[PDB]
Structure 1
Amino acid sequence: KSVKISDDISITQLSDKVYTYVSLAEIEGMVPSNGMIVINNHQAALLDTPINDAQTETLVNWVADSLHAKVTTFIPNHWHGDCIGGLGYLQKKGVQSYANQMTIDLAKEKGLPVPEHGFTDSLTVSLDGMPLQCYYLGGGHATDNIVVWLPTENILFGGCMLKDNQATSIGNISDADVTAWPKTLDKVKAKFPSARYVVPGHGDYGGTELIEHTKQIVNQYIESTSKP
């Protein structure tokens, strides 16, 4: 069950070392965004930030205050605001960051906060011993979207390329590679058959059924804009 905190943020524990959060933010709509907190030896990795510095700060102070862990590491799913909206603040805090080189390039060109270390295929970051396996498997929701796998926990943060089970629509495709998306999802499904929890960019987490569900939405979209 979730524990609600300030700045419209709630957090759920999935394992002794892994938590997933939902931060609600107002858009153009009060939209919910997801991220993860991974903790090992009182050090924490933040996977995606809430949309702004303020919510990010509240979240980071809570991890320090209640989870007794210092956020030292950060990894965003892609360049959108629900992934790097609070990166400015993380950098002032001195947090170390890793991201798809594509994400770094898009962030730079757009004048957005820029992650430090860039990878192009796979990267395994050791959070003082606990592995965070990041993978770029192709474009989808965003051209630079990655996924983060926690092998010791069997938990996958698929990010925005994955939709929750109650979703019916494709959503914002302004930055998507629509035809690559189903292919990226097949790769993700083939690579992480053991996933216990699969967390999407928005909505409720579930299991590997979200991958196939998301593939149906995307393929349905492609089918519906093909026709005469």
Structure 2
Amino acid sequence: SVKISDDISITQLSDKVYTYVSLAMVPSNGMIVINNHQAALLDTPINDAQTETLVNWVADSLHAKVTTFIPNHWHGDCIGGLGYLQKKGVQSYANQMTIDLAKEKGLPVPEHGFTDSLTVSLDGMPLQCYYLGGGHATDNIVVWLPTENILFGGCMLKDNQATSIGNISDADVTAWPKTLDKVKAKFPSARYVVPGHGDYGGTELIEHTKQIVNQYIESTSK
């Protein structure tokens, strides 16, 4: 990874897909997808400033203008810099459930809402968004890049070194493992599998995570 400003670093997984780690002392993940000098931002850092720096480096260093935004769910490590994006005039798409929780919380609201699946065309490149059930957040979705075989699973996925379930204040714990099943069943050809925090890996993150969730369900039923 390439270090940059505001506790932010970035790694390129392909010609068109980059994943970033934004530190706020917790590190959170997101993606930068680029096609024709246009970019999609999947999750924002925790606040506008980190988001501004990221959006600037994508222009400056990547020569791509951020025109699209898709959040994983309503948390700050997904929509924390949305306010600023909206000031940049960025178009956004989110699970309708994310939009409603965001309205109700007086949080920046994503623009267009879908309920099951959505395929956003970034000037031609497809960004497939799916809501497959509650997990880490009752509203969590996953974004799939069919052309790249890259899945950004978001916070419902843990990295290979994680051992804990984390914040379950907004989780649907018992749905979490069934949703991970649908994901494994749905994207068996994923080359890279990016989690909400930590290192990206492959589809093995789905099972490892399911293990943690099941261990949690097992531990609180004794």
TM bucket normalised to smaller: over 0.9
Gaps of 5+ in 2: none
Q: 1:65 and 1:225 mapped to 2: Cα distance?
A: 49
Q: 2:2 and 2:163 mapped to 1: Cα distance?
A: 28
CA deviation string 1:155-209 (max 9, x = no partner):
0000000000000000000000000000000000000000000000000000000
1:138 deviates by: 0.1
Q: 1:55 and 1:216 mapped to 2: Cα distance?
A: 33
1:66 deviates by: 0.2
SS of the residue corresponding to residue 183 of structure 1 reads helix
1:95 deviates by: 0.2
1:140 deviates by: 0.3
1:45 deviates by: 0.1
Aligned position for 1:19: 18
CA deviation string 1:123-166 (max 9, x = no partner):
00000000000000000000000000000000000000000000
CA deviation string 1:42-72 (max 9, x = no partner):
0000000000000000000000000000000
Gaps of 5+ in 1: none
Aligned position for 1:128: 123
Aligned position for 1:82: 77
CA deviation string 1:10-59 (max 9, x = no partner):
0000000000000000xxxx000000000000000000000000000000
Aligned position for 2:35: 40
Q: 1:97 and 1:129 mapped to 2: Cα distance?
A: 16
Q: 2:13 and 2:198 mapped to 1: Cα distance?
A: 15
**Matched pairs, number:** 222
SS of the residue corresponding to residue 26 of structure 2 reads strand
CA deviation string 1:56-102 (max 9, x = no partner):
00000000000000000000000000000000000000000000000
1:107 deviates by: 0.2
RMSD, aligned α-carbons: 0.2
Misfit runs of 4+, over 6 Å = none
% same residue:
100
Q: 2:49 and 2:169 mapped to 1: Cα distance?
A: 26
Q: TM-score, normalised by structure 1?
A: 0.97
For residue 65 of structure 1, the aligned residue among 53, 60, 64 is 60
SS of the residue corresponding to residue 88 of structure 1 reads helix
Q: TM-score, normalised by structure 2?
A: 1.00
Q: 1:73 and 1:150 mapped to 2: Cα distance?
A: 14
SS of the residue corresponding to residue 4 of structure 1 reads strand
Aligned position for 1:149: 144
Q: 1:92 and 1:116 mapped to 2: Cα distance?
A: 13
